[PDB]
Scaffold this active site. Structure first.
Site, short mmCIF file in Angstrom:
data_model
loop_
_atom_site.label_atom_id
_atom_site.label_comp_id
_atom_site.label_asym_id
_atom_site.label_seq_id
_atom_site.Cartn_x
_atom_site.Cartn_y
_atom_site.Cartn_z
N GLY A 340 29.81 66.46 45.16
CA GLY A 340 28.61 66.31 45.98
C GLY A 340 28.93 66.00 47.44
O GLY A 340 28.37 66.63 48.34
N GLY A 363 30.27 66.35 38.33
CA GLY A 363 31.04 65.61 37.32
C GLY A 363 31.86 66.50 36.41
O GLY A 363 32.96 66.14 36.00
#
Ligand SMILES: [Ca+2]
Ligand SMILES: [Ca+2]
Ligand SMILES: [Ca+2]
Length: 386
Positions: A340, A363
């Protein structure tokens, strides 16, 4: 090795596509369509073949069994209606059969509304599978989690395969991590080495050089014997940083940029790592270090980028990440980026078209790099293994 949707003939076949259509929604309307635009060629590939197409996704934060218009896929359906000539409709009750015609698109309501979804329920997974001839997994960003529409469905579907997005993701990750072109340089930036230790370990076995950044770099600086003052670092991970430093080629900032406080108003001071005062916090690497990293990245044939080398949110501590981001961009290396924070840096410096592959896996991207087994991928690898 996984079966590919693009290798299959889907003519008149019922196709269940798991996409990532978890888009920001405001007042029943999509506000960021990046995920839908990425998913569209997958949907249209099936539609053009005259397949009976079902697409579904997770959205927002719903409770299983508790319906909420707030977390409905209706805003995504409307977007799809505007962007597709094909008839599009939302279906809310489908666990016991759905009516789908050829060339039409059915959007199955938010899967996270269904009881058993998070727990990868067998009965729910079987119901998903019974709805289709072919299951298409096309959401890498959820592949690291074992869920009924991401994992279990692939156990019971006649054919389980990877969509174009998932396949492109696996190819990019493979190109960078499996026998890379050589000067494979990896960048791991973050606020804590503890949260990214497995990432550091995994990449330290692959990379010719492993560049540390941000709070991660601070702990490495403290490991070199330099006092970091009030900088963000982890004392209980100096030993891990020391272990990696003495056994791997890990560039450590020689000069640094410090602040008096943590703010967008705080001024920046350029100093060597030997001269950090007890009340000074490191928020970016210095000019001499940034130019050093830029040279390394220029000579690389493969670059993996994850995280910033400073607090680029503050203009006064953005210089370091700007130099690094642009170095990766202008490099002839195959560059893969994920995370991110990394993508926000990409947008900030406007270099999206200069990075060879941009992962939105979040993730799941980090967990793949760690060498961890991703359930959805493992499932597809197993079904593809005959
Ligand atoms: Ca339309
Ligand atoms: Ca169109
Ligand atoms: Ca320790």
């Amino acid at each position: 090795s996984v079966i590919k949707m693009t290798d299959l003939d889907l003519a008149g076949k019922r196709v269940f596509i798991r996409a990532d259509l978890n888009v920001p929604v405001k007042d029943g309307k999509v506000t960021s369509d990046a995920r839908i635009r990425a998913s569209l060629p997958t949907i249209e590939l099936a539609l053009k073949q005259g397949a009976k197409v079902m697409v579904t996704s997770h959205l927002g934060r719903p409770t299983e069994g508790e319906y909420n218009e707030e977390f409905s896929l209706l805003p995504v359906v409307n977007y799809l209606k505007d962007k597709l000539s094909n008839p599009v409709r939302l279906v809310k009750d489908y666990l016991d059969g759905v009516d789908v015609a050829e060339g039409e698109l059915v959007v199955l309501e938010n899967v996270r509304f269904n009881k058993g979804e998070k727990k990868d329920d067998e009965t729910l997974s079987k119901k998903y599978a019974a709805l289709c001839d072919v299951f298409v997994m096309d959401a890498f960003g959820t592949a690291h989690r074992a869920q009924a529409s991401t994992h279990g469905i692939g156990k019971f579907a006649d054919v389980a395969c990877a969509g174009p997005l998932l396949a492109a993701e696996l190819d990019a990750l493979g190109k960078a991590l499996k026998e890379p072109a050589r000067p494979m340089v990896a960048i791991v930036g973050g606020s804590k080495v503890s949260t990214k230790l497995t990432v550091l370990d995994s990449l330290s076995k692959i990379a010719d050089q492993l560049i540390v950044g941000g709070g991660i770099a601070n702990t490495f600086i403290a490991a070199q014997g330099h006092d970091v003052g009030k900088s963000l670092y982890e004392a209980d991970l100096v030993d891990e940083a020391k272990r990696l430093l003495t056994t791997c080629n890990i560039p450590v900032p020689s000069d640094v940029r410090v602040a008096t406080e943590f703010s967008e108003t705080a001024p920046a001071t350029l100093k060597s790592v030997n001269d950090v005062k007890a009340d000074e916090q490191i928020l970016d690497i210095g000019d001499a270090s940034a130019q050093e990293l830029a040279e390394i990245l220029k000579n690389a044939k493969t670059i993996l980028w994850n995280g910033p080398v400073g607090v680029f949110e503050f203009p006064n501590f953005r210089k370091g990440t700007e130099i690094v981001a642009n170095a990766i961009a202008d490099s002839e290396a195959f560059s893969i980026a994920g995370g991110g924070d990394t993508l926000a840096a990409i947008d900030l410096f406007g270099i999206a078209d200069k990075i060879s592959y941009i992962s939105t896996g979040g993730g799941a991207f980090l967990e793949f790099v760690e060498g961890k087994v991703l359930p959805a991928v493992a499932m597809l690898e197993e079904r593809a293994k005959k």
